Symmetry: D3
Subunit: 307 residues, 6 copies
């Protein structure tokens, strides 16, 4: 008995997911009382159901976290047989280090909050670091967006005379995996930035001058990393720059910084509800999440989607 | 080893609690990133400390809840010997029953969340129902508002042949304790629904005509319950109506509904930050919380400040 | 896979539950050694079964509690797929507040004990307060007595221009539901203390003189609360008084106090075994429990038997 | 802050324990309501206390179990720093095997019940099997009665021409340890009993005929094992028999079977409240429990009492 | 979906179990990096599978323990519906008491390690003591080797003038049962362990006279107990000595000591990989484990194997 | 009472830690029976002690892991007030992701095993990745080896024309910090692991030109990364290469490959017992661990070591 519900974060994705399998979104309501307190209710019976609750960590984030936790709790209190937290974008995966003393490793905290709310498993996509998987004791199915991102580049850009680029050192793994998949060279643009030598503006590594540059990242939030990588690419010689990421968070001055940038096109998935933009394009992962949910429900191989 | 910290919900209350036992507020910063994700940090060492974190559940409540959860988690991660969640107002205390099918008993969920975050105890004032205590496995010290509410009526009303009233059966327990510490007789109301229709066709009990009314309630949110009773009292007789509660929540139409109603004065503690109104007196409970905290730190009887 | 078992507390109720869904009572024996230690044993395999264990908290309650705990533990040790504690009467539901310092909130303790013993869910009828639900992490299905109590008043009283009364504010919720399903108006009492002095100087509300009284309460233990209201009703007017409750506990001076009081008839379910009296009618709820159990086993809406 | 409390099982022992250290029994009350439900309350503050609660598993056993669990729970709810279950006799240590299918390993169940009630440790004496220690995750200090039993035999009996006897095979370890300590031979009397051969009455092993026999066991409940070992000893030649055990449970027909037996004297500790008997003698372990409690409180070596 | 896998400890047993169920042995890899760290990987999906993992605690024991824990952990992380640790020989069942202060009750520790790795059940054979069952909260199915040992003795030995011999008190239960099974008389040794390799016979009990002695024990490790028991039986007049044990561990000097001893034949099961010796025989428990697994998967009675 | 103990992995380090605190090394025994099972025993009382147990994960790794778990378990069973697992080298920190499907995130598993054995804290040095911290719920104090490595380089090398080199992206944070500490420039390798023994350099980034290259890494295991990095630096024109790592594991072909390489000197700490080589140097971390332990015991700031 397969049931899908949505919070308020990304109902279009959740609707599209359910639709992909020929299922409706299950009926649930969440209210906000005058004192700003949340309330959650399922209209129909969840009893003995295999239930999947879709929520992304987009603004307002803390209302969405709590709605997810409450919906998970209520589903177990309503006698669901199994409850899966479907979290297309887990923003707190960025809070995965104790990089300053006396902070919260918030990703781990949220993993434990989810577990005590009653979640039996998680379904997610492109965690900020792969180690976040280890913050959960419950099973996590961690989906890749490489297939849709690779398809976007192979179909939209022109890969004759092209290179995939890593601006950060932490980007190298994902950019290398795309380069092998697309049959393209890899290049790097200096991460320091050379705070001593003659050439103060970014130093280059690999052939870029004539070529069309391809940037892959996990997410775009303020677009600050994106915009500075593109400017460095252009002054280093490059003809044009295309960008892709899994999570188009697009927050603060992101849209305007992208518009002002000479980047040609920026592709993101619909893990986060997409925003209006002439240069913004969205690659849907609703059929991918849907096929994962179906296989989780039926005990079919999820990893064979990516192998 | 006694350290005290505040979230963003009621820093004045915590500053007063701190000054009332001769200690400074501990340095802690809580940020928001552009993506609306919280970040918490303690500036000083808390190692082997007996730490108390003050947060009331005021708007925006989900950010305050999450910040509390993070601060408790970060304090245990920073090797605090003990951490107490000082929650002056626990708003989700009202979500204590499963009165609709397939909802979250959210007060219980939050107790569990606090515990997995790492809280060793709770210090709180005037919970909506006495059964909420049993939602916590950890010890909760449950401060009473009766002393400071009685010493307001005594110190600046002074009405012989007065009467004291409850808006709710449930707060009858509170109005059968004030009432009769002052030495007056009784009255009360009991109906639904605050989340439905207008305001509100009621049922009253007691002798009020040649008598002057005092109201005792746990909290005032929308002030509908307040205005209902004031209208019902000051129409079948009744010279004048005064009002008292522990939690001055004051949201939605409340501040305006107080001015429009013939109620003389409304009394609230500073569990929630004070909101400015014409006839709106607020009673500091910072000395009471500071005394409870001093006793908790030293292992002295906290029960002794009730009797 | 549907198996049903009883302790020693109310084998008749469980026999009727079993016969009402066409299944035999499962064979289980519980012994006492000379040293007063319990011993529990299942005679048949329960392996991968959906097992339901019926025990009410009747005298001697501690032996019945322990036998329930042992039977749940032994059922999980025997590899039951699922075990439900069918608790028709949960007496410790009354220990739900910390109204005295340094006591046990015993309802919570017992929920925790049941869970560590291995109970996956609880099936119960008419808990003393609705907050007890929140003492369980596991799902509790909370059966209502209103249908069978209404269908007693309708089927064998038949009083036009009658009135319906509550002994307790708290059971006002129950008397604001019966009341008005029948179509009569209201009345209620509210005071302390059953564990103190005689019986009992009270405070009543409503119009009773030219009207005939019905009483609705959660339970009747010593029947003091019953006799108090019957005396208070049948003295300021009132033709005749009838009585109804879910739990026919009937201990101490109760059976005698019923005969001595001018109350016409007392109605109770068979959650506790029936005690023989002159005007003492008992309403079988075995068909209702059997229907709830059938629904739990098959995953059908248990909420649907409330509406 | 060292505090000792007692349940109803063995207040004289608990009083003597506290007295041994120059401390009073702390003030606690336990009531039984008319419905047979328990209630527990501490009169004084336990806050930040190192609290020890003394209870033996003697009839009525299930009331005593529950009283212990409730007292442990209430002590943690009253903010004790540490709570130790002092269980001088743990009768359910006999329920330590799954020797028939589909039973409770009740000793393990009770260990988990104790832990969820809130016990931080256990202090006990002569567990029925040493493996019961492993049923607890919390620390258990397991005291020996060999010093007091050895002292009894060395001072009361006359060890010239004496032998210590094992009737059961399971007795051999404890009887051997006493034999080495007293400088006596060991003997055995057949455990089968030879269900085939010529001599149907018990077969002998080791020299018994002229000698005075000494029986040691963990406990005496019905005295059935004791009485049959003594009769076998007399018909096998023995002059006289003395018996000792840790736990004088003395239940059912124990007292009369001992009186009818030619056993000269039967010694037991006061872990269980002793019963009246001319041939019964009690060896006090109150000073031993007291010195253990003192050392647990102070972090001094408990095992050096026995080394 | 029934799925069987193997660690490195006893692949031939796992293979024989799989083949008796009509199934392939699931594909698992275990690697050791140059730093001596282990790595496990399931080659194909085990999602929603009923997973059985076979591992005996034979040398190298800690590698085998860790591999089992990792395989259980990886099975749960890969979304197994259920995982059973099939442990034919649980060697640490000998670490079942605190018989010196400040040691680990290692059997209990391992039970808890297994549980936190994610094991839902255990299937094992001939635990050293019957209390070890109680160290596990998760269900354990405990198989007897008595039927195959009895089938073997009926095959190989003349049973006209035979007697079954327990080499110590701890084994008396198992030997007794074999006696009652085969309709033979019973005898036993009181054993005193002085070291890991050296033991001593305190006394022999029962009619040996001139019989064919059948020794049965749980395990043979160094064979010190076996060969001392053989010597004791022979110069007590026995005709000949046959030996059987469940666990043929055969370490240290065992093989040499079996060769020197006049014992005619030593049979053990293949819970542990066998070792070559002229007098050594091995009985396979693959069919019994296969049948138990078949029944556990289908929810049929496992006790029915031994009754 | 501060108490230090050692497993078998690195007794010289534990001894040096103890001696720097002015304390004896606590008496522990670890035995291996003939069946390869471990046994631990503390010789003297550690009751109410602040217990620190030193164990590195060096070969034989699984024996050392199990010994640590047993020692932690035995410490708790022997009534330690607190136990800290001091793990100078946590080798399984490399098992921190699911980079193939159906593996164990072994670092997380071990974190949970440690917690269930009863560890209250961890003290460790230079974890392979900064996310491993989040695998532990219990507090972990994570010591940097950077101060001693910097003190060493300032001692042994000419720093006028030097550059610090990270041999992979995962180590860039640590190398960067050393650069900023010593006021030197920074360079790094993009590494591609092909097997446990074999790796490849994809690209070198930064100004080497004709400098004295200082490699710093977390660990040296097979030295494949070290020697590939050395070669890459040399035929990129570097003058000379010095290397330092925290963990000198030195397994497989490491010692031979260090001898062949033109690297001048390879320094590692003594987290792992050192191995003899002409170019090998070892820096002791006993004073730093001792100071951390001293501070943990006294509740003084541990971060203050590295700021
Ligand atoms: N959940 C979050 N959302 C946004 N920013 C965060 C979050 N958690 C941590 N940060 C910030 O991000 C930085 C940590 O990431 P950083 O180490 O710079 O990059 P990477 O995560 O790629 O290694 C810190 O400066 C911290 O303040
Ligand atoms: N945390 C909350 N804040 C505001 N309103 C709530 C909250 N939880 C529940 N409610 C609403 O208020 C109702 C509970 O109030 P009610 O039944 O009148 O009991 P009480 O008289 O104790 O307030 C619920 O039915 C729900 O609609
Ligand atoms: N399980 C129980 N059985 C009988 N009496 C109880 C139990 N628990 C508590 N009590 C007693 O009854 C009182 C609770 O009743 P009361 O305060 O009148 O609330 P209610 O009106 O909800 O019954 C407690 O103060 C206590 O003395
Ligand atoms: N808690 C208990 N009190 C009294 N008898 C018990 C208890 N638990 C189990 N028994 C009974 O005792 C017997 C188990 O003990 P047994 O194996 O005969 O002796 P031993 O415990 O010395 O090995 C069983 O027949 C069982 O019915
Ligand atoms: N896992 C183990 N493997 C081998 N020997 C062990 C193990 N655990 C404990 N021992 C040793 O065996 C002794 C217990 O043996 P013993 O009491 O003779 O067994 P039993 O009496 O149950 O036959 C312990 O004191 C210890 O020396
Ligand atoms: N505990 C371990 N010890 C040694 N090697 C390991 C361990 N765990 C995993 N590995 C191997 O190391 C690989 C990861 O290495 P790599 O990603 O190069 O490390 P990093 O990128 O963090 O420097 C894994 O894919 C696996 O082959």
């Amino acid at each position: 008995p397969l049931l899908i519900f949505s919070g308020q974060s990304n109902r279009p994705l959740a609707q599209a997911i359910a639709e992909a399998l020929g299922l409706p979104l299950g009926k649930s309501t969440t209210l906000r009382f005058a004192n700003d307190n949340l309330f959650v209710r399922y209209e129909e019976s969840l009893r003995e159901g295999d239930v999947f609750i879709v929520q992304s960590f987009v603004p307002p984030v803390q209302d969405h976290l709590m709605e997810l936790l409450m919906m998970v709790d209520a589903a177990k209190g309503a006698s669901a047989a199994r409850v899966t937290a479907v979290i297309p974008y887990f923003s707190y995966a960025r809070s995965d280090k104790k990089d300053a003393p006396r902070i919260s490793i918030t990703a781990r905290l949220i993993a434990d909050l989810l577990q005590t709310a009653g979640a039996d498993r998680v379904l997610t996509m492109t965690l900020h670091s792969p180690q976040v998987h280890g913050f959960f004791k419950i099973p996590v199915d961690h989906l890749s967006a490489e297939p849709v991102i690779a398809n976007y580049f192979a179909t939209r850009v022109d890969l004759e005379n092209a290179v995939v680029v890593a601006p950060d050192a932490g980007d190298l793994k994902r950019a290398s995996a795309l380069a092998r998949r697309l049959g393209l060279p890899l290049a790097f643009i200096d991460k320091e930035r050379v705070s001593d030598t003659e050439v103060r503006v970014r130093m280059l590594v690999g052939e870029v001058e004539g070529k069309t540059a391809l940037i892959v990242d996990d997410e775009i939030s303020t677009a600050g990393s994106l915009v500075e990588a593109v400017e460095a690419l252009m002054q280093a010689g490059a003809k044009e720059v295309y960008a892709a990421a899994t999570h188009g968070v697009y927050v603060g001055p992101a849209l305007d910084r992208i518009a002002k940038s000479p980047v040609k096109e920026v592709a993101a998935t619909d893990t986060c509800p997409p925003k209006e933009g002439p240069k913004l394009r969205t690659l849907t992962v609703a059929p991918l999440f849907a096929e994962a949910i179906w296989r989780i429900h039926r005990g079919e191989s999820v990893s064979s989607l990516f192998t």
